[PDB]
């Protein structure tokens, strides 16, 4: 990464958003820049050319401009789908390609409280000494939330973990999956599996649990 | 035109790297540079090597005495050679050319570490809408794939990044939410895919019998 971009940008649906790109006098100055978009998993897609052309498939709601040894994206009438991340592109002095470190792009979309579900280990993992206890947080927004795992009432720190997904691409919230892992004679010890969950959507925090023993098959 | 990398997903440190992108619905000496650019996880885009038409190779600088970028004619292919590799050449390897066209990319790990194949616990449903879905856990190195009933169910999916547990090895998990009045007739089944131990399998995700 040569090309300096900021770490993120974020504006509502519907909004404007532009995109920084500095360089140096060797590149940009002297050069042509390019931008890319890279939706999660995927490689990046050319989104504009010789600074502000754009090639066919690319709607007018993107385009770019440069000035000096910067450079900048512009993408009008933000839509859920628009979230990923943003690469510029240049030729050094010796004509070679460089990038930027990226941008990626947050839809503020409206508040949404996570629908919160609990998963016991399957008798199939106990039976292979482990026991993963998972809990699901779907689709909220914004990102932050706080997972907290209690044992029969004792506060579990440091044996859990957990992912994030990006933005959905059909209403922009985020999923959280948080995995608390007890080997099986930990787990036959106690009784109450329970997950606790606080975040902006939600008047009080939500928990879910369960008992060992509920449950079969 | 469709660009496709292949190569090993693992490879030891102060070994090479050998890669290669076969270029389909295009011949590969009408072809203005073919290269290879790649993405260290979470990061930007480096720069590796081109190949131009004459057959003229220029290299990253950084990388140079260690890159080999050669065309097969007969394959229609071009590959990519890196020698005595370390943690730091970690990254998502891209195929690229100019007729530009990128490949899908392919991760390869740099690690002392040894491949390791998936086991897949089911995460069943139970007490309008229910969650089930798929533990794929103690696999090395990335990635899996994760589809739902061979690709006719998307809807709702969520397959979450992969975590790095403390034993080295790695556990992803893959949900979805489907309404409750299905879980007595409609068949979920998780396609787990682990190509570096070449690991597939379906695994059907029934109810639990709670009380």
């Known amino acids: 990464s040569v090309l300096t971009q900021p770490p993120s940008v974020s504006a509502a649906p519907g909004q404007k958003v532009t995109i920084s790109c500095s360089g140096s006098?060797?590149?940009?100055?002297?050069?042509?820049v390019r931008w890319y978009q890279q939706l999660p998993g995927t490689a990046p897609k050319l989104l504009i050319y010789?600074?502000?052309k754009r090639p066919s498939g690319i709607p007018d709601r993107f385009s770019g401009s440069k000035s000096g040894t910067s450079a900048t994206l512009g993408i009008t009438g933000l839509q859920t789908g628009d979230e990923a991340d943003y690469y510029c592109?240049?030729?050094?002095?010796?004509?070679?390609?460089?990038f930027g470190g990226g941008t990626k792009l947050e839809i503020k979309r409206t508040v949404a409280a996570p629908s919160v579900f609990i998963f016991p280990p399957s008798d199939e993992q106990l039976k292979s000494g482990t026991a993963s206890v998972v809990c699901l947080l779907n689709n909220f927004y914004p990102r932050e939330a706080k997972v907290q795992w209690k044992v029969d009432n004792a506060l579990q720190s440091g044996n859990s973990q957990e992912s994030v997904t990006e933005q959905d691409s059909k209403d922009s919230t985020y999923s959280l999956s948080s995995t608390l892992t007890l080997s099986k004679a930990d787990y036959e010890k106690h009784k109450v599996y329970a997950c606790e969950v606080t975040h902006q959507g939600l008047s009080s925090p939500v928990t879910k649990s369960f008992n060992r023993g509920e449950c079969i098959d | 035109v469709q660009l496709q990398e292949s190569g090993p997903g693992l490879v030891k440190p102060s070994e090479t790297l050998s890669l290669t992108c076969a270029v389909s619905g295009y011949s590969i000496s009408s072809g203005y540079y073919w290269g290879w650019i790649r993405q260290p996880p979470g990061k930007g885009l480096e720069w590796i090597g081109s190949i131009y038409h004459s057959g003229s190779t220029y290299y990253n600088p950084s990388l140079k005495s260690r890159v080999t970028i050669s065309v097969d004619t007969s394959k229609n292919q071009f590959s990519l050679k890196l020698s005595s590799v370390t943690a730091a050449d970690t990254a998502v390897y891209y195929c690229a050319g100019l007729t530009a066209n990128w490949g899908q990319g392919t991760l390869t790990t740099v690690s002392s570490a040894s491949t390791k194949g998936p086991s897949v616990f089911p995460l069943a449903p139970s007490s309008g809408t229910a969650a089930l879905g798929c533990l794929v856990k103690d696999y090395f190195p990335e990635p899996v794939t994760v589809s739902w009933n061979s690709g006719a169910l998307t809807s709702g999916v969520h397959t979450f990044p992969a975590v790095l547990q403390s034993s080295g090895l790695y556990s992803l998990s893959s949900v979805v939410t489907v309404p409750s009045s299905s879980l007595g007739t409609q068949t979920y089944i998780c396609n787990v895919n682990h190509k570096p131990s070449n690991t597939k399998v379906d695994k059907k995700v029934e109810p639990k019998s709670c009380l």
């Open positions: 592109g240049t030729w050094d002095s010796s004509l070679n390609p460089v």
């Open positions: 006098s060797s590149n940009i100055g002297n050069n042509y």
């Open positions: 010789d600074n502000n």
